[PDB]
Design a protein around this ligand. Structure first.
Ligand code: SF4
Ligand SMILES: [Mg+2]
Ligand SMILES: [Mg+2]
Ligand SMILES: [Mg+2]
Ligand SMILES: [Mg+2]
Ligand SMILES: [Mg+2]
Ligand SMILES: [Mg+2]
Ligand SMILES: [Mg+2]
Ligand SMILES: [Mg+2]
Ligand SMILES: [Mg+2]
Ligand SMILES: [Mg+2]
Ligand SMILES: [Mg+2]
Ligand SMILES: [Mg+2]
Ligand SMILES: [Mg+2]
Ligand SMILES: [Mg+2]
Ligand SMILES: [Mg+2]
Ligand SMILES: [Mg+2]
Ligand SMILES: [Mg+2]
Ligand SMILES: [Mg+2]
Ligand SMILES: [Mg+2]
Ligand SMILES: [Mg+2]
Ligand SMILES: [Mg+2]
Ligand SMILES: [Mg+2]
Ligand SMILES: [Mg+2]
Ligand SMILES: [Mg+2]
Ligand SMILES: [Mg+2]
Ligand SMILES: [Mg+2]
Ligand SMILES: [Mg+2]
Ligand SMILES: [Mg+2]
Ligand SMILES: [Mg+2]
Ligand SMILES: [Mg+2]
Ligand SMILES: [Mg+2]
Ligand SMILES: [Mg+2]
Ligand SMILES: [Mg+2]
Ligand SMILES: [Mg+2]
Ligand SMILES: [Mg+2]
Ligand SMILES: [Mg+2]
Ligand SMILES: [Mg+2]
Ligand SMILES: [Mg+2]
Ligand SMILES: [Mg+2]
Ligand SMILES: [Mg+2]
Ligand SMILES: [Mg+2]
Ligand SMILES: [Mg+2]
Ligand SMILES: [Mg+2]
Ligand SMILES: [Mg+2]
Ligand SMILES: [Mg+2]
Ligand SMILES: [Mg+2]
Ligand SMILES: [Mg+2]
Ligand SMILES: [Mg+2]
Ligand SMILES: [Mg+2]
Ligand SMILES: [Mg+2]
Ligand SMILES: [Mg+2]
Ligand SMILES: [Mg+2]
Ligand SMILES: [Mg+2]
Ligand SMILES: [Mg+2]
Ligand SMILES: [Mg+2]
Ligand SMILES: [Mg+2]
Ligand SMILES: [Mg+2]
Ligand SMILES: [Mg+2]
Ligand SMILES: [Mg+2]
Ligand SMILES: [Mg+2]
Ligand SMILES: [Mg+2]
Ligand SMILES: [Mg+2]
Ligand SMILES: [Mg+2]
Ligand SMILES: [Mg+2]
Ligand SMILES: [Mg+2]
Ligand SMILES: [Mg+2]
Ligand SMILES: [Mg+2]
Ligand SMILES: [Mg+2]
Ligand SMILES: [Mg+2]
Ligand SMILES: [Mg+2]
Ligand SMILES: [Mg+2]
Ligand SMILES: [Mg+2]
Ligand SMILES: [Mg+2]
Ligand SMILES: [Mg+2]
Ligand SMILES: [Mg+2]
Ligand SMILES: [Mg+2]
Ligand SMILES: [Mg+2]
Ligand SMILES: [Mg+2]
Ligand SMILES: [Mg+2]
Ligand SMILES: [Mg+2]
Ligand SMILES: [Mg+2]
Ligand SMILES: [Mg+2]
Ligand SMILES: [Mg+2]
Lengths: 208, 82, 96, 137, 99, 122
RNA sequence: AGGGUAGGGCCCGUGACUGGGGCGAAGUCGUAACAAGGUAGCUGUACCGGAAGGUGCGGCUGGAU
RNA sequence: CGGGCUAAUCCCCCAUGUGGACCCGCCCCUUGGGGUGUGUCCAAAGGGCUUUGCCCGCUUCCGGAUGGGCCCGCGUCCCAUCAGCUAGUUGGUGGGGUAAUGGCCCACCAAGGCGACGACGGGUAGCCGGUCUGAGAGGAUGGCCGGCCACAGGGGCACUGAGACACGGGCCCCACUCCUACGGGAGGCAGCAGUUAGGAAUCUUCCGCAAUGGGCGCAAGCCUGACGGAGCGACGCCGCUUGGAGGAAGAAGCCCUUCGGGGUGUAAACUCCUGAACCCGGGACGAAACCCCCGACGAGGGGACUGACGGUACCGGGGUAAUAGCGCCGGCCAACUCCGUGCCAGCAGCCGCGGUAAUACGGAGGGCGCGAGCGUUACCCGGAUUCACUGGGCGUAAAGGGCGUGUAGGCGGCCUGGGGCGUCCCAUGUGAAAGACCACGGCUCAACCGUGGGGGAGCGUGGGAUACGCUCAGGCUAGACGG
């Protein structure tokens, strides 16, 4: 399946902060906050000139690892968007964010997509009323996403819920809080999320 | 004779018969002479049946005859409206 | 081991029997007058020729012959008679 | 001589490199009709029907770019490029849909047609095609 | 429709039939260039009228015999023997392409 | 050349010369060893490489180089081979496959085991 | 159909022996070419010679001075 | 085998001829098309119900409709180290024959037919839609599905027939095997599974006609290895899980150390939360028709039976932390150190690693990439712009023929006119559907499948324009030839 292994090693090797769990990634107990150098026996050694390839290799994994998606699942969409109209970048981006799990986390239902998926994969979520244990469902504009009424009685949801009431949600997002029923408004533009990514670099990558 | 009947398309457990005209000596799903309707039997759409009630009467005029259920499909198509 | 084909097969030979006979008789009579055509005998020739026509046609009634064929054997029959009877003549009966 | 057209074109391309105020060519209504295009688009200055020791010609009056500094002050060419297309060795024919657009729109291709010589654009406007004479820029 | 071909006669030696050589042009499927290809057809001449050098128009007719499927539709021109030369000269030249 | 010529003679779609004929367009052919021994390579190397000469259901008979260290190959040993030559060893074009037939993988081998037919310890 | 008699054509495999060729090398003989390579070299043929090769006739310079 | 008997929608004659067949004549047409007249020929079948009427059938003749046969044009692989082939061979007259042209068959007259536009021979291969690669032109390919063809152990043949020269029909011959009571008989999986053999390797001797479709029947119903499903196989694609959050300036073990330290490592442990599977309850869509009731067996409206997959998916309640394996780490090419070893044992796709300090073998620590996958081999396109139409090149890198003459062929200077072959434009028929491409819709997504939409090249028909190519005709003199 997805990754599911040691994760901090991601942020480190990348040299950037990926808030892959939730709270700690903000805490001063973080790795990059403590050890922002490569994992393994050779982290603190002077890095050397990465290759033009190696570079383009990064941005990918960085993004790819950000959502924890199989390489394949990350070819399709970018074969999707690339064969999709207009600027392949924005589309693929919107194609990625359009995943349930993500949006679920983007809707502050869980600190990590990792949680998002599980709650998603555990069907605790719903959409337009319908229940969806499908962490790969490409949610489209006009979709009503509702927590499982059967799981509205859970406390974790509310602890993440509570820490959301008036929290700032994406322009292409709402969050009728309490009702545990958000909503997915539109497809974003690059300027809608300033990810630590240079998407074109990933374009250059599969251009091989 | 040339008859009118349903050619099963779709996939396993996924019926989608094209109500079409061809020779019985054809295989079930082989070459037909003309398509003239389509039918979701399981009722997965608000429009799981259509007929070119006009053309459908064309062939029947020229003698073609349908399978029973195809005759039904053409029934509710009203094709037999006196 | 066994099938209705055995029933199917048998009938043929019987049917096989019945067709070959007619054709044989046809050509038997069809030509027979033709000889007379070479020496007509106009009256007697046209007497045969008519007979072959019936057998020929009457074969077309069943699997024995196809209409176009019988017509051919018919057509090609008549044609020959007169042409032969031309050199000499002349037809006593019909026809025609 | 095989193809006067390329020869015509060739004569041009041969002088433009040496920077001739003009140059000459044996005449023909077709060569002219061509040249007709080659000033209305602005690659040439125009032609006049001259005449050499008894024979007709077409002294073409050449247009070039401005003097320049650097070490190579020689004036850039108007006709950067001019090469034959359809030839006697390989006659080349196009339908209106398959009519190329020279250098993204900065050049043209002269086309012989039942409706007179045209440019890559004029044809598409008139909705026809023909024997691609040449492409030039 | 019945295909009409505008070919020349190369043989009258047969009786009640002629050899109409038909020539056609076309581009190359890869090299654009126009490329001449010919092909002899066997025309039916019931009245043994058509003669050597006669440019003619042949029409796809029902089979008269084997290989003979085009009758002569109508005459076009006469005296066209130059073409024959461009035919026989060929056949004659072959006599040196052996071993 | 002239377009005409290209029309007359066209261009020659040169084909490929397969590098594993003894296979007869197959990925794996069984054989039966015939000369289990060692073979020295050409320069600039020096050693005693582990070769296997095998007759095939394809009728042929070819040297097959035995990869790894330590094997169990002697005359009459059922075996399978694969495509792949050994640059330095002329006369060898194909490989053998350990852990297959009368051939067993490498002993106390832990890395890249797949390429050496050696299952997993604890 | 086919079976038989007889005689031709073509291709694959196999064969005492035989002719060269390729690769390996750490052997033997000499040292032909690469410098004026110690007789300028190459070339066609012809002859000769354990072998690279020599030589005769004519040719090219892709010959040094 | 034979002797003798019996019915019919079986077979035979006669009658009736709307009509149809043939001859000969004539109108039209124009290849044997339709109409017309005299002579000749020919149809048939009954059974059932509620019974002077219905339904099913039977006969002919026209037409429709679909499925075909034959014929033509252009296109369809490799070798010229195959350069000549041909006697049914090419044409004709006349007959046979078929549904029909034909040398498809026979007889006779003639001497003719094919070929460097590659005949003849050999090797290979089932073609197309499409499939994959590809920026494209192009290449490779033709399983699955759809169409057509050809074969039904290896060959030949005709009968039956609307239709075959017929896979589970028949006649014979050959090869093979088996049975046997030893006199003699039988068989043909390239139908669904299955066995044996060959091989690197390809599955169940499963369920059922419920659906769709097919034959037969008025219907009831029957047959149904087509079809619908189950199973096996990581064979390919899609989806999902092996957990989530919190969690020390950081346990042990393990690897490195300059002995201060560093790395594994938020990883674990443990706390909480969620809850794959596995337990129970419920439990389908697919299935509305034929048929039966009224009406009129019809339009239309009412009435039931039926589910192989299957108690499966799916719905509800409850509920366990619950598989990780593979390749790679000298450059290409992302990912580093330590020991062992010492041109030995070894990796290798290329350049090349090892001869006592190996980022290149082995192991380990750590790390890189994917992830129920991971790798290898084989083969196809790509990179290969390296057979170059797009889109290459021949002084010394591989490539100008030793030199001329000349056939075919390719190519061809200025001006006018006709034709309209290439060529261009418009209209139009075909270009099946599946697939590819855009939009959307159903399985909770996707893969898969459905719906609609949107084009072309190519060739068939009609019209048009005339610059260049070509053709026919008239002039000219700038190439050539000549005095
Ligand atoms: S945010 Fe911090 S704690 Fe979270 S994965 Fe990244 S480095 Fe680790
Ligand atoms: Mg795009
Ligand atoms: Mg690419
Ligand atoms: Mg007799
Ligand atoms: Mg008949
Ligand atoms: Mg070009
Ligand atoms: Mg070495
Ligand atoms: Mg063997
Ligand atoms: Mg053994
Ligand atoms: Mg290989
Ligand atoms: Mg490995
Ligand atoms: Mg014989
Ligand atoms: Mg015999
Ligand atoms: Mg010397
Ligand atoms: Mg020396
Ligand atoms: Mg010397
Ligand atoms: Mg010499
Ligand atoms: Mg000697
Ligand atoms: Mg000497
Ligand atoms: Mg000399
Ligand atoms: Mg000389
Ligand atoms: Mg010289
Ligand atoms: Mg020198
Ligand atoms: Mg009786
Ligand atoms: Mg009668
Ligand atoms: Mg027939
Ligand atoms: Mg014959
Ligand atoms: Mg003779
Ligand atoms: Mg030709
Ligand atoms: Mg050739
Ligand atoms: Mg193929
Ligand atoms: Mg295949
Ligand atoms: Mg097929
Ligand atoms: Mg056969
Ligand atoms: Mg057979
Ligand atoms: Mg068999
Ligand atoms: Mg047989
Ligand atoms: Mg049979
Ligand atoms: Mg057949
Ligand atoms: Mg069988
Ligand atoms: Mg079988
Ligand atoms: Mg075996
Ligand atoms: Mg199966
Ligand atoms: Mg059934
Ligand atoms: Mg049925
Ligand atoms: Mg009844
Ligand atoms: Mg019964
Ligand atoms: Mg049965
Ligand atoms: Mg099937
Ligand atoms: Mg954790
Ligand atoms: Mg239950
Ligand atoms: Mg249902
Ligand atoms: Mg549950
Ligand atoms: Mg645990
Ligand atoms: Mg790998
Ligand atoms: Mg390595
Ligand atoms: Mg190194
Ligand atoms: Mg890689
Ligand atoms: Mg590196
Ligand atoms: Mg290795
Ligand atoms: Mg090197
Ligand atoms: Mg070392
Ligand atoms: Mg998977
Ligand atoms: Mg390749
Ligand atoms: Mg590339
Ligand atoms: Mg290319
Ligand atoms: Mg080059
Ligand atoms: Mg050279
Ligand atoms: Mg020369
Ligand atoms: Mg000439
Ligand atoms: Mg001209
Ligand atoms: Mg003209
Ligand atoms: Mg024209
Ligand atoms: Mg289509
Ligand atoms: Mg959907
Ligand atoms: Mg579609
Ligand atoms: Mg397109
Ligand atoms: Mg079109
Ligand atoms: Mg046209
Ligand atoms: Mg004109
Ligand atoms: Mg010409
Ligand atoms: Mg003239
Ligand atoms: Mg002059
Ligand atoms: Mg002169």
């Amino acid at each position: 399946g997805r990754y599911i292994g040691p994760v901090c090693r991601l942020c480190r090797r990348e040299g950037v902060k990926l808030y892959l769990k939730g709270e700690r990634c903000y805490s001063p107990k973080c790795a990059m906050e403590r050890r922002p150098y490569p994992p393994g026996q050779h982290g603190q050694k002077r890095a050397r000139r990465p290759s033009d390839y190696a570079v383009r290799l990064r941005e990918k994994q960085k993004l790819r690892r950000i959502y924890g998606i199989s390489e394949r699942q990350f070819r399709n969409l970018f074969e999707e968007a690339s064969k999709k109209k207009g600027v392949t970048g924005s589309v693929f981006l919107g194609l990625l964010e359009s995943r349930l799990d993500n949006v679920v986390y983007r809707l502050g239902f869980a600190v990590s997509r990792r949680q998002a998926r599980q709650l998603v994969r555990h069907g605790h979520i719903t959409v337009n009323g319908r229940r969806v244990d499908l962490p790969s469902y490409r949610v489209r504009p006009g979709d009503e996403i509702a927590v499982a009424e059967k799981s509205r009685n859970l406390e974790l949801i509310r602890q993440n819920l509570e820490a959301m009431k008036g929290r700032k949600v994406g322009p292409w997002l709402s969050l009728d809080v309490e009702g545990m029923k958000g909503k997915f408004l539109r497809l974003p533009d690059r300027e809608d999320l300033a990810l630590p990514v240079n998407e074109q670099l990933v374009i250059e990558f599969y251009s091989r | 004779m040339v008859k009118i009947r349903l050619a099963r398309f779709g996939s396993k457990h996924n019926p989608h018969y094209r109500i079409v005209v061809t020779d019985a000596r054809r295989k079930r799903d082989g070459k037909y002479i003309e398509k003239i309707g389509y039918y979701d039997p399981r009722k997965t759409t608000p429009d799981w049946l259509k007929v070119d009630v006009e053309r459908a009467r064309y062939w029947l005029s020229v003698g073609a005859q349908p399978t029973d259920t195809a005759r039904r499909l053409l029934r509710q198509a009203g094709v037999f409206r006196q | 081991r066994n099938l209705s084909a055995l029933k199917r097969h048998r009938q043929s030979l019987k049917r096989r029997l019945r067709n070959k006979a007619k054709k044989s008789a046809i050509k038997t009579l069809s030509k027979k007058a033709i000889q007379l055509a070479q020496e007509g005998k106009a009256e007697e020739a046209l007497k045969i020729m008519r007979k072959a026509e019936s057998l020929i046609d009457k074969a077309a009634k069943g699997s024995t012959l196809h209409k176009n064929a019988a017509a051919r054997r018919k057509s090609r029959l008549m044609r020959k008679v007169r042409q032969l009877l031309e050199a000499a003549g002349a037809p006593l009966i019909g026809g025609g | 001589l095989t193809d006067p057209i390329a020869d015509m074109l060739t004569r041009i391309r041969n002088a433009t490199r040496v920077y001739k105020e003009s140059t000459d060519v044996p005449a023909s209504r077709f060569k002219e009709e061509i040249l007709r295009i080659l000033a209305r688009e602005g690659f040439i200055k125009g032609y006049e029907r001259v005449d050499v020791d008894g024979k007709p010609y077409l002294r073409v009056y050449l247009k070039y770019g401005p003097r320049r500094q650097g070490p190579d002050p020689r004036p850039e060419q108007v006709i950067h490029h001019i090469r034959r297309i359809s030839k006697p060795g390989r006659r080349v024919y196009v339908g209106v849909k398959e009519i190329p657009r020279v250098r993204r729109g900065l050049g043209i291709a002269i086309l012989s047609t039942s409706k007179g010589v045209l440019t890559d654009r004029e044809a598409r406007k008139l909705g026809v095609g023909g024997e691609l004479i040449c492409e030039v820029w | 429709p019945k295909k009409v071909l505008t070919g020349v006669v190369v043989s009258d030696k047969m009786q009640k039939t002629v050899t109409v050589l038909v020539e056609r042009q076309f581009p190359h499927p890869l090299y654009g260039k126009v490329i001449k290809r010919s092909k002899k057809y066997l025309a039916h001449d019931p009245e043994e009228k058509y003669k050597l050098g006669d440019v003619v128009e042949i029409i796809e007719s029902r089979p008269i015999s084997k290989r003979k499927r085009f009758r002569v539709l109508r005459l076009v021109e006469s005296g066209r023997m130059d073409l024959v030369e461009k035919y026989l000269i060929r056949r004659q030249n072959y006599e040196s392409l052996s071993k | 050349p002239t377009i005409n010529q290209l029309v007359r003679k066209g261009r020659e779609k040169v084909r490929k010369k397969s590098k594993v004929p003894a296979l007869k367009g197959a990925p794996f052919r069984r054989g039966v060893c015939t000369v289990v021994r060692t073979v020295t390579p050409k320069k600039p190397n020096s050693a005693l490489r582990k070769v296997a000469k095998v007759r095939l259901t394809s009728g042929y008979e070819v040297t097959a180089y035995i990869p790894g260290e330590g094997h169990n190959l002697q005359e009459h040993s059922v075996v399978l081979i694969r495509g792949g030559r050994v640059k330095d060893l002329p006369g060898v074009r194909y490989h053998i496959v350990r852990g297959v037939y009368d051939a067993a993988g490498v002993k106390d081998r832990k890395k890249s085991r797949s390429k050496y037919g050696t299952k997993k310890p604890k």
